[PDB]
Amino acid sequence: DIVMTQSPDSLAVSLGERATINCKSSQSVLYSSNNKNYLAWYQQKPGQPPNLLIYWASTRQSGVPDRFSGSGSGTDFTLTISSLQAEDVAVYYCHQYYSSPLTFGGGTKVEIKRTVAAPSVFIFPPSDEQLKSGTASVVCLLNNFYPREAKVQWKVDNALQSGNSQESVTEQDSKDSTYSLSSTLTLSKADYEKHKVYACEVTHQGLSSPVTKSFNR
Amino acid sequence: VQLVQSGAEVKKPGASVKVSCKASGYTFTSYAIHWVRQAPGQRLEWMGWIKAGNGNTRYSQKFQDRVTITRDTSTTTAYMELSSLRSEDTAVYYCALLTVLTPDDAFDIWGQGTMVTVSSASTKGPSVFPLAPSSKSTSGGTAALGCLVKDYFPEPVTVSWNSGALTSGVHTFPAVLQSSGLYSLSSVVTVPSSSLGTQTYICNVNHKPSNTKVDKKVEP
Amino acid sequence: NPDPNANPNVDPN
Numbered sequence: 001d002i003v004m005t006q007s008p009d010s011l012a013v014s015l016g017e018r019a020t021i022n023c024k025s026s027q028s029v030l031y032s033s034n035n036k037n038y039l040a041w042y043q044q045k046p047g048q049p050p051n052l053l054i055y056w057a058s059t060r061q062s063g064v065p066d067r068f069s070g071s072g073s074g075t076d077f078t079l080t081i082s083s084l085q086a087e088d089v090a091v092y093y094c095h096q097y098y099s100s101p102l103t104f105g106g107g108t109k110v111e112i113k114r115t116v117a118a119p120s121v122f123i124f125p126p127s128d129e130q131l132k133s134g135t136a137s138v139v140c141l142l143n144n145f146y147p148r149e150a151k152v153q154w155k156v157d158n159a160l161q162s163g164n165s166q167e168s169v170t171e172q173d174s175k176d177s178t179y180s181l182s183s184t185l186t187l188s189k190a191d192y193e194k195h196k197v198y199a200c201e202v203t204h205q206g207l208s209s210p211v212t213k214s215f216n217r
Numbered sequence: 218v219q220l221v222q223s224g225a226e227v228k229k230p231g232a233s234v235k236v237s238c239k240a241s242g243y244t245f246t247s248y249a250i251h252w253v254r255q256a257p258g259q260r261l262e263w264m265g266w267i268k269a270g271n272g273n274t275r276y277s278q279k280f281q282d283r284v285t286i287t288r289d290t291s292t293t294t295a296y297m298e299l300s301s302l303r304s305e306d307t308a309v310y311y312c313a314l315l316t317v318l319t320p321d322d323a324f325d326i327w328g329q330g331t332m333v334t335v336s337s338a339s340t341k342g343p344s345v346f347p348l349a350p351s352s353k354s355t356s357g358g359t360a361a362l363g364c365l366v367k368d369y370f371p372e373p374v375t376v377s378w379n380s381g382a383l384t385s386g387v388h389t390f391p392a393v394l395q396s397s398g399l400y401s402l403s404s405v406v407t408v409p410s411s412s413l414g415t416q417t418y419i420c421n422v423n424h425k426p427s428n429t430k431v432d433k434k435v436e437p
Numbered sequence: 438n439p440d441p442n443a444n445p446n447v448d449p450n
Contacts, residue, residue, distance in 0.1 A: 031439050034449060038439050040316055040325075049327030050261070055316055061323060093261065097316055100443040101277045102251070102263040122354040122361045127346045130367070137365055139348055141405055143356075143388070166393040168402070180388045182403045184365075186395075215353050249445040268445060275442065317446040 002026055002096050004105035012111040015177070019081040021108045023094035028074045031098075038098035041070055041079045044107075045090045046171045053092075054079065086112060087174045112177035118206025119145035119181070123199075123213040126192065136192035138185040140200030140213065144178040151203040152183045155212075157195040161185065192217065218242045220250075220312055220328035224425030227334045227371040233300040236331045238312035240293045243324075246270030250295040251315045252286060255330070256308040266315075267295060302335045309333075334371035338398055342427030343369035345420070347435040348405065355410050359386075362435045363405030364420035368397070369427065376404035377421040383408075413437055 003026035013019050029038045037057035042050035052061050054070035057077060067082045081088055089112055094105040119142035126136040142150055148169060154161040167183045183200065199214035223237040238250060252264040265276035267286040274286050285298040295312055313327040348354075348363035355361070366374050376389045386407040392400040404420055422431040441449060 029439075031449070033438075036449065038447070049311055049313070049330055051327075052316065052325035055318065055323065055325075059323075061325065095316075097439075097444045097447055099440045100275065101279075102315070102443055104261040104263075106260045120356045120361075122356070124348040124351075124354060124363070127349070127365075130344070130346045130365075133344070137346070137367060137401075139363075139365060139403055141354075141361060141363075141403075143361065143405075143407065166395070166401075168390040168393050170388055170390060180390070180405075182388075182390045182405070184393070184401065184403070213353060251444070266445065315444055315446060319448050320450065 001101070002029065002099055002103050004094050004096060004103055006094060006105040006108045008108060009106070010109040010111060012113045013084055014113045015086060016083050019084050019088075019110055021079040021092050021110075023077045023079070023105050025075045025077070025096055029096050029098040030074045037073055037077070038096055039070075039077055040095040040097065041068075042093040042095060042104075043090045044093065045174070050093060081110070084110070084112070086177050089172045089174060089177065111172060114146050114177045116206045117144060117146045117178055119143060119150060119202060119204050121200065121202050121211050121213045123215060125198070125215055125217065131189050131192070134189045136187045136189055138187070138198050140183045140185070140202075142181040142183075142202055142204075144173070144176060144180055145204055145206065146178045147205060148179045149205070150181055152181070153201045154183070154185045155197070155199040155201060156185075157197050158199075218314065218324055218326045220314065220326055222312060222328040222331045225332040225334070225371065225373060227336055227338070227340055227426060228302050229337050230302060230304065230335055232302050233298055234302060234333050235296055235298045236310050236312075236333070238295040238297070238328050240269075240295065245293045246290055248314055248317055250286075250288070251313050252284070252297045253311045253313055253315075254308045255311065256305070264297070269295065299333075302333075304335055307333060307335050332371070332373055336371065338370055340426045341368065341370045341399060342424055342429035343367055343374060343401075343422065345422050345431045345433045347433055348403065349435060350408075350410070350413060350437050358410055359407045360410040360413060361405055361407050362418060363403055364422065364433050364435060365401070365403050366422050367401045368395075368399045369401075369424050369429075370399050371426055372400055374402060374422055374424045376423075378404075378406050379417070379419055380421055383418070
């Protein structure tokens with residue numbers, strides 16, 4: 001087993017800055033008789049399979065933008081992104097094809113640092129179609145904010161709720177480097193019909209005080 | 218060069234799964250198709266390869282007794298059977314033409330991946346509900362709308378808007394796991410509020426484990 | 438030395 005060890009595990013840099021990812025192989029992957037390093041670099045964005053950037057340690061595959069470059073020889077390899085663009089947010093892996101079994105590194109997650117953006121907050125009552133099933137889902141949407149840290153609280157008839165909601169946050173956006181978050185409050189239809197006011201209160205760095213978005217059933 | 222895999226599945230502990238990999242756009246018999254799995258939060262794991270023309274194989278020591286890779290040259294398809302499925306086998310399984318480096322050419326292609334979930338829980342298709350645009354979902358001349366894809370198992374569901382013609386402004390959120398053991402996700406899109414009257418917005422929801430293909434028009 | 442059968446697809450040339 002050739003162990004491929006990457007460093008750092010993650011790195012955050014601002015748009016246009018240089019990004020350096022290191023990969024060390026636990027034994028040399030250089031064959032002196034042909035002077036080739038049996039190493040490759042892959043980029044994986046979420047929902048996509050790994051995408052080959054570099055092979056033979058430093059040969060960029062056709063179609064790969066010129067800002068990606070590999071260097072190193074033997075055991076110490078370096079992937080450089082000379083000027084990070086927003087779409088480069090991804091996990092980068094090294095890979096050796098020197099010996100069986102083929103192995104991959106643990107990945108380096110590259111993130112963008114950017115200016116504060118407050119969330120745009122929206123609230124969606126349950127559809128009448130869902131209510132026919134005896135359950136009500138209220139959805140609160142926090143759109144295109146940065147940084148990722150955000151707090152959502154649910155209030156029903158002005159009372160703070162606990163235990164009946166779930167959140168999910170997106171990956172970082174490939175175009176504006178923001179995040180979005182959806183929170184769903186789940187109630188039985190009977191409970192939903194018992195109350196008037198449904199509200200979602202959002203705290204975020206871009207807000208000087210919490211924003212509440214609400215509706216009456 | 219293209220590799221197209223079969224859809225996600227759920228299988229009980231101790232059962233088998235057989236993932237398919239249809240290739241095209243190149244000479245099938247000339248290269249080896251690898252199988253690589255990506256488990257939750259773990260690094261990619263090479264499982265084995267098969268020479269597509271000849272049929273010879275090599276398996277990782279991990280997956281020696283339990284994996285069988287095969288091919289059919291007439292349909293340009295490779296297969297990977299994994300038996301005695303265990304808890305740790307839940308993962309996304311890729312076939313791939315890993316680093317094909319010839320004198321003539323250099324290419325590297327991956328299938329889209331097949332999520333296999335090892336669980337005794339039953340397959341269930343989602344219910345799709347609209348998140349209608351309203352006065353509570355507007356900001357700065359835009360309106361947010363979406364679809365709530367509730368109560369399905371196993372992962373994943375995929376969502377497109379207007380059959381892939383609407384992509385700008387789309388956020389499809391990672392699924393949440395309810396205490397029931399069922400999943401739910403939301404997909405939202407931000408559109409011009411000025412043209413809600415003339416444009417049509419349809420979420421196309423796919424859940425291949427349950428053969429669910431749903432189109433939901435989302436109206437004010 | 439490299440194992441050429443680790444990935445048959447690689448021509449070491």
